[PDB]
Amino acid sequence: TDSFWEVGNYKRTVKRIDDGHRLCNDLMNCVQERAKIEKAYGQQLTDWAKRWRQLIEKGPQYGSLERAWGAIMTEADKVSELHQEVKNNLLNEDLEKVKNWQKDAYHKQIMGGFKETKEAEDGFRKAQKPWAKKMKELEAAKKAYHLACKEEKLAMDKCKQDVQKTQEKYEKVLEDVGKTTPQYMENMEQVFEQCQQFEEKRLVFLKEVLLDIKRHLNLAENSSYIHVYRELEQAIRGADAQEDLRWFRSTSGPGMPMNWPQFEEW
Amino acid sequence: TDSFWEVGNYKRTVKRIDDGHRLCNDLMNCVQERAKIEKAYGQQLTDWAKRWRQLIEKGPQYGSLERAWGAIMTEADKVSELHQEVKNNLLNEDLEKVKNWQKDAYHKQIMGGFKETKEAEDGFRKAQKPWAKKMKELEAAKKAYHLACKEEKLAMQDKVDKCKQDVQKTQEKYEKVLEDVGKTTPQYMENMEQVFEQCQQFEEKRLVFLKEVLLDIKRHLNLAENSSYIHVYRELEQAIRGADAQEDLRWFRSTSGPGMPMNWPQFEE
Numbered sequence A: 001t002d003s004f005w006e007v008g009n010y011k012r013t014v015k016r017i018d019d020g021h022r023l024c025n026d027l028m029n030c031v032q033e034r035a036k037i038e039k040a041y042g043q044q045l046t047d048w049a050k051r052w053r054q055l056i057e058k059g060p061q062y063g064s065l066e067r068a069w070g071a072i073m074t075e076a077d078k079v080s081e082l083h084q085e086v087k088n089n090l091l092n093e094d095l096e097k098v099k100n101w102q103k104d105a106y107h108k109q110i111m112g113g114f115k116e117t118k119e120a121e122d123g124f125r126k127a128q129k130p131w132a133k134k135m136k137e138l139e140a141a142k143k144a145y146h147l148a149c150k151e152e153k154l155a156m157d158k159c160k161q162d163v164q165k166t167q168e169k170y171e172k173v174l175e176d177v178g179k180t181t182p183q184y185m186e187n188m189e190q191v192f193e194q195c196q197q198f199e200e201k202r203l204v205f206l207k208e209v210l211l212d213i214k215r216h217l218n219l220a221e222n223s224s225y226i227h228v229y230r231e232l233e234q235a236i237r238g239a240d241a242q243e244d245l246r247w248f249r250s251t252s253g254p255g256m257p258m259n260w261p262q263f264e265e266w
Numbered sequence B: 001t002d003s004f005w006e007v008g009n010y011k012r013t014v015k016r017i018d019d020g021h022r023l024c025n026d027l028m029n030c031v032q033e034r035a036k037i038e039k040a041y042g043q044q045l046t047d048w049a050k051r052w053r054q055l056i057e058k059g060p061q062y063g064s065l066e067r068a069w070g071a072i073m074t075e076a077d078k079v080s081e082l083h084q085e086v087k088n089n090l091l092n093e094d095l096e097k098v099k100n101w102q103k104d105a106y107h108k109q110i111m112g113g114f115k116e117t118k119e120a121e122d123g124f125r126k127a128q129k130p131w132a133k134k135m136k137e138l139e140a141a142k143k144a145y146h147l148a149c150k151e152e153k154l155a156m157q158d159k160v161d162k163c164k165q166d167v168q169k170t171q172e173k174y175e176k177v178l179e180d181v182g183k184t185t186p187q188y189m190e191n192m193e194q195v196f197e198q199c200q201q202f203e204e205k206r207l208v209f210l211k212e213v214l215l216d217i218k219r220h221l222n223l224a225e226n227s228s229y230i231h232v233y234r235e236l237e238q239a240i241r242g243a244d245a246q247e248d249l250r251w252f253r254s255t256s257g258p259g260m261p262m263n264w265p266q267f268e269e
């Protein structure tokens, strides 16, 4: 009695419809929440880069090694942009893709619920109408029989006659449900199949939107991520210790020009 | 009058030494703060993956596509791990590296300042000791001679003959000094020079190490240094491509639909 074929259990296939709308909601939020995280990290990176671009500037570090060190806040900036770029590609391109599909696939009934849920609910019920009727007409003819049976095994004449009458009807109803049973299955099959087709439209779209997000989350397989570190490494391997020393000698040490003592008239 | 060669301008070179100690601190705090940032991203992703792994589990989403959607929460988890390691490396490998270098390079004295700073300042003083003396004598001489000159310009008759005799007697002393200064400059230079070169060698060991530590930091920050970062979006994609719409449908048919078994009506006694 959890079988789709039992009266009323097509309802799970019906809830499934509603579910789809909710899951669209769910995906939208999921994506949204990931965006706010990618933003927080990019913001914190720029802040840090601001901090230190300034502290490295105002401090005693000089020459090329001051620049190499400063090339790090440059990656923090470039990397932050990339995350801030991921946040937009999630909100302008992915969350919107789902918003519009959701918008167009489900039409709320101005009065309530979805037009898509109603139609399936309505079609199952019509498909099941006769079967449900017979199925109650079989409830009685069994009760009235099981009652005349347990009553004829009590008076142990007219009781045995009433059991031949109830048994006869009962078996006739079995005959019907049998004859009606195939069209019922055809009918329900038909509505169910219309439900799959709609759910397939959704899953297929889901799979597509999922690949979209994987693409907007992947900083690798992007030349821009890998490039910032080729660049950083180049910037640092650039720095020359000697060169820095030579620059200090020349501007703060024995390299400085000097006006030595000379005769002064007057 | 800001040239290194002017008296006591070796000062900046001495400062450079103390400066290197503080720059070690500065690099440490820098790396430490960045590590805190990496850690934060790490946690927020971890939290996100957990909340959503749960929401998706308990949701109405079933089959392949649930696993696929769920496969994102996994890349969040893996990407968290990678940043948590950036943080670890920044703290445990890099920050620690400069700390131990800083500890071996600078030696505070019980009685004030760093050993290696005093050594440098003693070096420069000793080296500049004579030169500054001659250099003060040259200031005396120079004024004397100039006073005599002024005194004489004012006078121009027996006052003139006494005033000429001074200009002469004094111009002699001023002159006799310039000559000493001149002749002792090369030694002054040599000595200042030797001391500065010791300072260069020390700062070179610092800069050199600094460059090496900046590489270390670059490799740690770079998630693209490891194939682990590629293989997380390689794995992610192949999980989603694993998705099968029609198979999920077929699964639901037999699990919730017309494929579900059924005990059709029968005679019961």
Ligand SMILES: [Ca+2]
Pocket: A056, A057, A058, A059, A060, A061, A062, A066
């Ligand atoms: Ca600076």
Ligand SMILES: [Ca+2]
Pocket: B056, B057, B058, B059, B060, B061, B062, B066
């Ligand atoms: Ca689920």
